[PDB]
Structures are given as structure tokens and as C-alpha cells.
Paper text:
The human pathogen [name], a member of the pneumoniae cluster of mycoplasmas, binds to eukaryotic cells by means of its adhesion complex, the Nap. This complex is formed by two heterodimers, each consisting of proteins [name] and P1401–6. In addition to their roles in cytadherence and motility, [name] and [name] are immunodominant proteins and constitute the main target of host antibodies during infection. Here, we address the structure and mechanism of the Nap adhesion complex and reveal an intricate interplay between [name] and [name].
Using a sample of [name]–[name] complexes, with the complete extracellular region included for both subunits ([name] residues 23–1351 and [name] residues 23–938), we performed single-particle cryo-electron microscopy (cryo-EM). We obtained a map with an overall resolution of 4.1 Å, although non-isotropic. The [name]–P110N X-ray structure could be fitted as a rigid-body without modifications into the [name]–[name] cryo-EM map with UCSF Chimera16. Therefore, the structure of the [name]–[name] complex found by cryo-EM corresponds to the conformation of the X-ray [name]–P110N structure, where access to the sialylated oligosaccharides binding site is occluded. In the [name]–[name] cryo-EM map, there is no density for the C-terminal domain of [name], whereas the C-terminal domain of [name], which is absent in the [name]–P110N complex, is visible, albeit with a weak density. This indicates a significant flexibility of the C-terminal domains with respect to the bulkier N-terminal domains. In the [name]–[name] complex found by cryo-EM, the interface between subunits spans 2758 Å2 with 30 hydrogen bonds and an estimated Gibbs free energy of –20 kcal/mol, resulting in a 100% probability of the formation of the complex (PISA server). The interface between the [name] and [name] subunits, defined as tight in the cryo-EM structure of the Nap, is the same found in the cryo-EM structure of the [name]–[name] heterodimer.
Author numbering: 27 to 118, 121 to 255, 261 to 412, 416 to 813
The structure:
Amino acid sequence: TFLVKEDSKNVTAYTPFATPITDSKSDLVSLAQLDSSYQIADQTIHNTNLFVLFKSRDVKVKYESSGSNNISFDSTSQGEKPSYVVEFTNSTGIKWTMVKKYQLDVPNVSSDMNQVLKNLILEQPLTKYTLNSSLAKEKGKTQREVHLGSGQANQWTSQRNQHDLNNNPSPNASTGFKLTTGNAYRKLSESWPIYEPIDGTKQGKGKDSSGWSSTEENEAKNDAPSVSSGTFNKYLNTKQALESIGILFDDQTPRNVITQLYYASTSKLAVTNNHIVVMGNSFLPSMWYWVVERSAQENASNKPTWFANTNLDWGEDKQKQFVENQLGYKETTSTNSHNFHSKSFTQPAYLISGIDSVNDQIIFSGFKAGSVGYDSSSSSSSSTKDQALAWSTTTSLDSKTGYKDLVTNDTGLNGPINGSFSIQDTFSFVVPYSGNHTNNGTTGPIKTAYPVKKDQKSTVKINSLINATPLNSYGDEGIGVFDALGLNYNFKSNQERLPSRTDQIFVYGIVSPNELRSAKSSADSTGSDTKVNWSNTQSRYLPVPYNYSEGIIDADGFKRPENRGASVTTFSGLKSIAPDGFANSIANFSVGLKAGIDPNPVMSGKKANYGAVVLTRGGVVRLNFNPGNDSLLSTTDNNIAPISFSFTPFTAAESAVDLTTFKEVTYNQESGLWSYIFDSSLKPSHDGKQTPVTDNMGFSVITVSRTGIELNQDQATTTLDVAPSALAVQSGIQSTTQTLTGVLPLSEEFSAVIAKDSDQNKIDIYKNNNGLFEIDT
């Protein structure tokens, strides 16, 4: 029998004949002995029992920079509503009864962690209505402007050696983006605004919470009023959009960053034979995750593990350093120059695609949320004051071809180097040279350095920030756009896309029960921050489709003259033509990670195959694993890109689907097919211009199938050299009128759709032809 979620707290069971079981509508929130403010966040089936995640709309969390126990629930005003994971069972018809109830307590904080948190600042979440221009921030100081000062041009050649930028050919390379304007950056105790600038290069107060609350917020309220009578020339009102992505409010005002971080961090559920795993959502970053031992006592506090303590394998040692060297500045010749890199932490947040389990293994994926240092000096003063220190790390044109050599390239490892370079009859934004290489021949090794002057080394305060997108540098320049859309190509006979290693990074992997026990120990460590190691992980540069932006039509080394023009080179300039329910065409999104075991037989004496699929902006990604080792699939040749990742573009039908309305991902074990359910009723009621939405009705379903030569099929396929892929195709189940309840996969050859057009229910039976549906009236 199949289970259907009637609403935010009720669950109704159906027989395989698409008929509802009488007296089966159960209120699990009531059953779990939880109050009205709670609703079911995620459901999964393990060991035949239903595991349910619950989260309260009434949760309140505080961050107190002083003290030992910094992150805590606000007991005082009935905000001590932690999230719960409950095991339910059938005691027979359908009669649910609670087995175990686990509570997810806030994270513990060390002395070292709290020194980052004290001055940690966070970007306002990205919305359905957020533009390329809202995201855009004013360009920072030039490399020669930081280390040398103003009017120090054509003196670079003689002075670059002292500042340890020996032979560096890019004085004009940007050092980051200014934080005095653009999208709001807030402390964990501070709250985010309902307003978003239309142009971040001009409108906005960035990290200046004080300057916003005193003067700018009032201009914002006047321009972009809630419900319209408003002008909407400088600002967008996204209260409705914010609310639709899980933002909690005190009427009009959103709750502080820490509360939003908690509520969104308890979004997805995975269950193994000994552990329960809880991760965040795709909308806003997750700085932690929960590993709950299923053997935990009735009233015990289950604490999360920080991502800043979970050391991942980025594929290569160099790939990890790239991410870390940009997290902040080291040495701390100041005293309060605390950031993540200095306090010896790793990547602190991820925008989680999802989490699932196969053969007691946990599978995760997501994009790495951008994180960089920033200056907070407050005065003469430092040249980098009120600015983020981020840069492009895209592989140089002169680099060796072959995946391993492209990703290990020392281009932009310690400091910035990319810009704009004229090559023959075209151009590039990536530095043409690395090592001893120059146009004349060999000139001595090229050096890079963190954008901090060595004279101002002591009188500088480099603290930490976290972005709401997979973009590290938002500085309004050429290279920013090519790194975001994947428009950097080499010029050698065999073309190759030069990857970035900090911007639009997709991280994925498989976690063992012992790797999860390690994670649990780190959450329970008191005193020192205990470090975790996840071995079977990988990273891949996954950018947004270039054709989602107006003005770009191909991806080649040769670039047309019109493509050096400002209108299609900077963020504010760039215009979106993306149909996937996002106003921006620059930041990538991922959702619906679901793994499944292949029904097709494998060679005798070999373990059954299993993979995972996930949806990203522009296509479907497939994660390939070796079942004999329960590791990521790999191959002998390093020149070929990790065979554990595959990407297949979408067509106009799949691109048309609003990725922000993802409801549920299912997998049919007998078919080997994934059903991606999108409910249009998950749309916000009003635009950024407060105009009522008129397309929040209906649904859509996408089928995902395995393609390619699969492992251990025969004697030849015992090893692979090509990554097996996936295919996303609009199933044929869709509506613009009906409001979906759920989809019953009645059989391999049949499916049932439960919906309401005018309150009364309707059961639609569709004919299934290996993933392709046509209605049976």
C-alpha cells in the first residue's frame, strides 16, 4: 500500500487499486506528541517503518558572541521548539504508532569557532525574483592599487618582487568586491531585509546593517511597499518569495540569520541501519548537519557536526587548497584577524542538493556556497577596507590538457591573476601564461599573493563571510561572467573548457557508517574542534547554461567582438532569458538527489549496481559508484575527468519546468526510473513587484533514465573509461488547472494521479510506456 501527504500534517494510505483506505488519514504531528506549530518536513521508509522529520514555524534561536554556550533556543518567548525525527509503525488496515522520537539540538561552539562566528557575516538568500544585477556588487581595488597604492602605474615591474608577485602580469587584476552597497550581509544575531536592490552596484547597504536601518531601509520601504501603489525603481519586495523558501517572520520582520540557518538546516532526511542523517535545503546554506545514532536514549540531545570540521576530498590536494586559500588570510599579525582559513577550518557551508541511502551508505551532493575573507579595519586606513577578498581561479590558457593537469594548475592559487587579454584576432579573460611562460619565452616563475599589503599586515582585520550562491566573487567584471557561464576555453588544437576551482563548485560523495560515526564524535567533542575525513567525495566545476543569458550563443575559444561589450560582460549588464523559474541566469541551483539500485542483472559474483541522479539548472547529473567497494566509480587515465560524474542537457520541455517548485523525487525499483514531481502550488503569491502570481496552479513530472554502458554487465565491462549517463524527459503527466495531492506508481505499466480541480477529488489513470505517459479516460 502507498502513503499520500494530504496536507502539512496528515497522511492517507491507498491500496494498489488507487482506492483510499478508510480510517487511514493520520495526523502524525499529533501522533508524534508535537504541537500545532509543527509540520512534516520530510518522510522516508526504512526497515518497513516510516521516519518523519518535523519542524516548527515557531522556532527561535539566538547567538551570543560572549560566553561558552553561544548558539541556543530562545526559551523565554516559547521558541524552544527543536526539530524532531520520529519512527512510526503499523500495528495491524493502517494504524500508526510511535516507536522512537529523536530531537535535534543546536550546535556546540568552541573558543576557536566562536572567534570566526563573532564577526561572521551572511548574504541574504537568493530568490526566484533575484536578478543578475541584484547579485552584482561594485568591483574592488586592483592588485597594483592594494600593494602599491594610487598613481604607482608602470612601476609594477620594479616593485612587484618586494610584494612577492614576482613576474605577475596582471596589475589590473581585481582583488574582490566592495561591501558598502549591494545585497545585505548580516551577523548571526542580525536579521535580513524583505528588500533586494534592483542594481547592487548602486542600491543597497551590503554589510552596513547600521546604514540600512537608519536611512536606506526607509527609502526601500517607500519605493517597494508590501501589499501595488509602489514605484519599484530601486528595490524589490520579496517577502512572499522569502516566505515560500522557508523564511520565518515576526509578522513583517524576518527572524535573525541564526534562526533561518536552523530552520533550513533541518530539511532533508536519510536513514541507515544504525544512523539517521539530517541535512539542509537547496535554497540557503547549511553550516552543519545531524548524525543521529538510532540507539540514542529517549530524551538525549542529538547535536550536529559542522561543515567547517568535515574535510572532504575535492578530487586533488590542489583542488582543496584553492577553496581554503580564499577562505581568508593567515598569520594574524593583528589579534582579531579571525576567519575560517586562519582558525584552520575548511569549507564551512554548502547548498545541499539532497541526501539519500543505498546499501547502508549515505549519498550527498550540492554546490559549495561561496566563502571569502573581508576587511573590517574602521581606521589613515587599509586599502582593502569595507571589501571582500575573492578572485578568479580559472586555469591558464597555456596549461596542459587533461583533467588532472587542468584542475591542478597553479593559476590564481594564492592571489588574483585573471583579467582581459588580447590574443591574435580574439581575446580571453583568463591569464594566457603560468610558470616561467611569457610571450617572449621564459622569464622566471609567476607568483600570486593574498590581496593584503605587507606594510598594513598588522593594522588589518580579515574576517569571514558566506554567500547565498555557488559564486565566490560577485565583483562586476568580465571574468566573473565567463566563470559563472563556463565560457573560458583554451586555444590549443584540442579545445577544453578551463575550469574554476572556487566558483560554481558541485561537491558530491558517498559516506560509510564509520565515516558517519566520526562525524558524530566531532559533534560530541567538547573543547577542541575535532576533524572529520570523508574519502569518497569529489568536486566538479558545474556552471549555468550559457544560453540561459541573452547574447551568448556558443562556447568556443574564439570570441566575437560584440562579446567584449559591457552589456554581455558584466553582471549588471547581462540579461536573463532563463525559463526555469529564476530571474537570474548566473547562479546554479541543484535539487532532488535520489539514488536507486539498477534492476538490470549484473555478471555472476558481482554486486548489484546503484547510482544517483540530481537535477541542476540546464540538465540532469548522474553519480556513478562501484558497488564492489561502495566507492565512487573511477578509471586508470587521469587525463579523463572523474567517471563518477555525468551531465546531460535538458530540452525546452525540461528547461520550462520551474526548479523552485520541486515537490518530491521517487524511484521505481522494478523500472529503474526516477519520477520528479513539481507542484506549481509551491509558487509565491506575489512577484518582487508585489503583483499577484497567475500560474501557481497545476503540476509537471519529469522522468529520468539510465543511459550508456553500465558496469559488470559482462567480461568487457568489468572496468569503464566513459561515465554512464542519465536522460531527463518530460513524462507527459502535467496540468495548469488541477492542484496535485500525490502520484501513485500503481505498477510498472500504470500510474495514478490524485488532484483537486474544484475541492472534489479526481483519480487520473495514465498509461505508462517505459517512462512516457498518456492519460486513460
